[PDB]
Design a protein around this ligand. Sequence first.
Ligand SMILES: Nc1nc2c(ncn2[C@@H]2O[C@H](COP(=O)(O)O)[C@@H](O)[C@H]2O)c(=O)[nH]1
Ligand SMILES: Nc1nc2c(ncn2[C@@H]2O[C@H](COP(=O)(O)O)[C@@H](O)[C@H]2O)c(=O)[nH]1
Ligand SMILES: Nc1nc2c(ncn2[C@@H]2O[C@H](COP(=O)(O)O)[C@@H](O)[C@H]2O)c(=O)[nH]1
Ligand SMILES: Nc1nc2c(ncn2[C@@H]2O[C@H](COP(=O)(O)O)[C@@H](O)[C@H]2O)c(=O)[nH]1
Ligand SMILES: [K+]
Ligand SMILES: [K+]
Ligand SMILES: [K+]
Ligand SMILES: [K+]
Lengths: 329, 328, 329, 335
Amino acid sequence: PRIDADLKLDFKDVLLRPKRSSLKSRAEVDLERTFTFRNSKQTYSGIPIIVANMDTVGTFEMAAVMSQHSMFTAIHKHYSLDDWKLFATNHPECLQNVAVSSGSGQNDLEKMTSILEAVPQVKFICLDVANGYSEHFVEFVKLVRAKFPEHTIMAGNVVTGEMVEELILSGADIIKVGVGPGSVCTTRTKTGVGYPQLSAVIECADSAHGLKGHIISDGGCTCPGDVAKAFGAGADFVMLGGMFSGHTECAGEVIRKLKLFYGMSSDTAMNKHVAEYRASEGKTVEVPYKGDVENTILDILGGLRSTCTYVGAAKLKELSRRATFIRVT
Amino acid sequence: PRIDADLKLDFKDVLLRPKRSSLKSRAEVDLERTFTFRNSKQTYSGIPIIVANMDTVGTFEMAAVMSQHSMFTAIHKHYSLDDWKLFATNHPECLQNVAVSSGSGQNDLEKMTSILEAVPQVKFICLDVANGYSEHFVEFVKLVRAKFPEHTIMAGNVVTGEMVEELILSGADIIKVGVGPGSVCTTRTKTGVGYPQLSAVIECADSAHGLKGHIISDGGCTCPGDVAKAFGAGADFVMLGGMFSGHTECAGEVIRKLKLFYGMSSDTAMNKHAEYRASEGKTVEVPYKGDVENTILDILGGLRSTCTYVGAAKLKELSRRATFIRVT
Amino acid sequence: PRIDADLKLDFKDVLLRPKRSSLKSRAEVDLERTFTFRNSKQTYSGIPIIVANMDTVGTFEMAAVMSQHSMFTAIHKHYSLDDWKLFATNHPECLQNVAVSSGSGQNDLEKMTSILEAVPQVKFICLDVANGYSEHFVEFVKLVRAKFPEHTIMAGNVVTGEMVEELILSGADIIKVGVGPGSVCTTRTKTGVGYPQLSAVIECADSAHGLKGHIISDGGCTCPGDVAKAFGAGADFVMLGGMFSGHTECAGEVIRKLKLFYGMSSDTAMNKHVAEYRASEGKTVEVPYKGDVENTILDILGGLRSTCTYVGAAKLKELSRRATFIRVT
Amino acid sequence: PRIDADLKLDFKDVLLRPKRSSLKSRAEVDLERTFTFRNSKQTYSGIPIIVANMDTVGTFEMAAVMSQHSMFTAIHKHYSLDDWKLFATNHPECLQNVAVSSGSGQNDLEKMTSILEAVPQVKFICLDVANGYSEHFVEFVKLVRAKFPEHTIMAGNVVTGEMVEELILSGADIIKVGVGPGSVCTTRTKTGVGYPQLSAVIECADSAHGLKGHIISDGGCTCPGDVAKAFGAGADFVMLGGMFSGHTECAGEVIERNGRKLKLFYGMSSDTAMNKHGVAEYRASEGKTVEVPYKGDVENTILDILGGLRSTCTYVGAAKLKELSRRATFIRVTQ
Ligand SMILES: Nc1nc2c(ncn2[C@@H]2O[C@H](COP(=O)(O)O)[C@@H](O)[C@H]2O)c(=O)[nH]1
Ligand SMILES: Nc1nc2c(ncn2[C@@H]2O[C@H](COP(=O)(O)O)[C@@H](O)[C@H]2O)c(=O)[nH]1
Ligand SMILES: Nc1nc2c(ncn2[C@@H]2O[C@H](COP(=O)(O)O)[C@@H](O)[C@H]2O)c(=O)[nH]1
Ligand SMILES: Nc1nc2c(ncn2[C@@H]2O[C@H](COP(=O)(O)O)[C@@H](O)[C@H]2O)c(=O)[nH]1
Ligand SMILES: [K+]
Ligand SMILES: [K+]
Ligand SMILES: [K+]
Ligand SMILES: [K+]
């Protein structure tokens, strides 16, 4: 029973230091990123901010707006094959900016397979388990890789670099990083297992990039600054659920105006459809109705352009290279 | 007046790191543990989570439910001989999963003696004092050991390894660890004496296991994760009061729906029935949680998940595979 | 502008470790202490817990109860000479357990002088200034010492050992230690000057005892545990205001039932009568009505007996010797 | 992506240690400070506490009070030329105690130029950008210096000493230090960029004084203790917005909700400011809009600030505010 001597930090524990540059204004900043993935060998270009594949936020209506801003949507796994066919028919321009989501079960794999065959324009797969450290997940990734050699594979979640390497070597292109921090995640309270989001991203990013692989910082961001910190720590993408919750484009009706936001393995999800899809049985919360998601997007992108300006990054690419954190109280 | 340079952590200061394993699902995990005790030489098998011997939670009704899940109940010391006789008559299947509780007083010892002679199926004794570091307690343990050489003895409470050794060498099989962190304990506020629960368990577990003895992490767990951290830190058992408070099976009626939960040495206990525990405990109104079944399932479920995530197929393996990280 | 590398702790930051002993029960513990003062050469015996010389708590009615428990009362400086005469007439058994209080003003010195000459049984003087680090205070101590060679002199406040030494060498017997922690003190908010109470007492106690002098831990205790930690850190006496506030014996009527409790240099005290008596213009608070102080005394003494039991101290004298602190979160 | 090993502290993390001295009473302390600026070569005398150039606090009505106490007011940049002319007409005694404010835009520079030409008695300029680390701001400072060689230039905001040096070498006399801590600043939340205010001042004061330059601690003070701490850490001036917010002298009428008197206080680059006025990238973040409790007349707040800083100086042994930093020793605390 060892205690790690190293203190692990989250986003609230740090700030980014401003640095000298020739960038006056935030509009000068290019947030678009180009990635060539390790295993799929595919090339991606866009603003690497991903809507999480949760029931309320990972929707086709959200994708349609996100895609307008060159942003990415991981679509929740509970849409039917027909729903995807309709989306492809009506929103072909978005298909480059979505991922189809699957658990490690036989049925999920079948359903996903059918969607991918029916919609060849979808080139991203998002794989999620309760235990991303399992040998059974490693072998599921190997299988999906072999079944879809040209699809880009997102796989999670982990918080440590050895499992990043193993999953990348096993066929995943992009590793989803985060266990505990998620707004409705409850691992810490229900299992005492987890990891601070910053330190997770810091360590895992190193490990991924040593293999020419990529990571998603998955969860923990409560504001655009955290999104900026995630990127500064080395995250190739940033995945957000809570910050996108509560908008008009979110699934659900308005309930003080509120929208319901619930974990992917929540009791609500369990009743609606998910047992060990995520590491914990997530919370169900009522979030304040934020209105149209446009305005939230603009605030996130704008704040990230400002961060880049202030650290001297003309491109989001350069952020990590120019990110220096200070520890605060 | 020295200050210890080492910072002592509680559960909220740490997390458990996940580790690579071949365990997909939490249902795979075996929470049952088999212990052979050092002094009693008895063997126990069950899920080593214990309901604290407090008035509201350490009840026969609670024990009847706990025993169905192979879990243990330390029965509060205020039940009569007749009440035990009735419980033995009606719930013989439970007797292997309960402990009879006693203070260090002559009257307590006599009453416990009568209960154990009347109910030979009860093979666990729980002893509790205000000052678990006193020589008087050491001698009382020696006496109880001598009086009941084949009963397994739980004795507390302490927070440091030297006293763990002393109590084990004096005849206790299992040492109850924790002074301060208890939900209704008030030692820190009233005496300024105490110890963080994680650091207590870390140090005390080593000390006990060096003698082939055992410990109970007693108090401080506010959620199943803490229960998991306790086990990861080396606790052989984990004892819970606050987390079992507020249920239908708890002593008391419903009072917002609430149940009353009070310290073993509280003013409420003193009026209802002095230095049983290290502090005069709090009396709190806790939210009515409903049936305890659901709570048990949450605790066990979360602990199975923990074990899955660190690669422990059995609860035995937890501490071996527990690596903690310090957090803010 | 240097930052001290050593983190300074308060009471909340530590716990006392229990230790092996032959003490079963708390009733076995003797809280009485016997002190022989350095400069006055007087001897004191009692339970070295002092009611602070504040308007509401440092009263004759309070002293009459405290004396029954062999405890001390520092009487506020706003009682008249006649009030003292009457208290000597009616409560002669208390006079050994009270101190007369004075500021460093000429009028305060005269009034105190008249009280001490009229009541020769009062053998303790309590001196207080806004700036206990002042050469002006050093010289006032010298003067009081010379005027009253056989009276025991409490002087404050400080938080550091070099001033402890200077004040003792100047003729004070007992140094009041604490600047900031007081329940209605506001130095931190109003001046940013202060010192954590535990670290104050640790460093100051050493410094005092090196000269065969004594200290009072003045302020910061919110509960009997803190009182125990004060003593554990080396405090010869412990002085309490907030903990004694709110009782039937306290000056004021009942106002939820409440009693008013206000700083010695508060706006309330300024209007009632102080300017630079204490380091900050103190708060005025409404405290919950606690009832009769007997009960509070019993809780304080009882908890301190328990502490001594748990560390193996049969006498309060032995506490610091047997006090080991652990740092907590 | 490096993490700085050094923990950076804010005001809450420290206390000032009292020290032995001959000063009994706080009235003995002289808070007035004399500065001779590096680039402007001007000499200033006063109590080096500045009202921030925000909409509600940096007013002419506030300046007229502040000046009475030899205190300084940075006037917000949205006053007209005529408004300044009227202020000069009516309050000539204050003009030495105010600064005219400008962003780095062409229109701001021209308006400020007109004000300075019309009011020659105003000898302080306050320059503020979103990114004080920009080469475009360095250049703007060089141009203002050249345009007004005898005016004293305030320029910000930064948090690090290399930018202090650059800005001073480029012609600013006084560097405004602080990014993050401001009451209605939101950089940390919106951008994740920022710096603790104490560590800012410590580092940046050293850097400025090495050049015989000066700094303002801009933002973060929530009480007079913080103000004292700022000065203790090396700040030549201390600039305050939230602490002056909510008074009778402040722009705006009293608000009345739920048995509560309040005044509105908003960021210089807030949505409120954007709607009311050319503030887009004036400051590093789009600032908050808050309702602050009505505090009454500012006189009383001033007296609390000055009184508490006199006390601080007494307790550390500083007979002059000048001596504070020399006699400031901080201790690290927990709460
Ligand atoms: N452990 C756990 N994580 C969840 C659950 N639901 C969503 N999450 C995680 O939290 C991430 C979103 O983080 P957020 O932005 O909500 O803080 C998701 O991408 C997902 O990885 C759940 O029920 N349990
Ligand atoms: N010191 C003290 N501890 C108590 C009292 N009542 C209960 N406890 C402790 O707190 C434990 C339960 O802690 P919890 O599970 O509520 O954190 C009990 O098993 C017991 O050891 C009391 O009155 N005083
Ligand atoms: N600075 C300052 N300290 C006060 C004032 N009133 C009481 N105190 C301090 O607080 C002490 C009592 O602290 P407490 O026990 O309430 O924490 C008093 O003995 C005195 O030293 C005041 O008005 N100003
Ligand atoms: N970054 C940013 N800072 C602001 C804004 N409005 C005011 N400030 C800053 O906050 C300072 C006042 O801080 P305070 O003393 O109120 O904590 C100003 O001098 C200025 O630096 C804003 O909209 N954005
Ligand atoms: K969470
Ligand atoms: K407790
Ligand atoms: K205080
Ligand atoms: K701020």
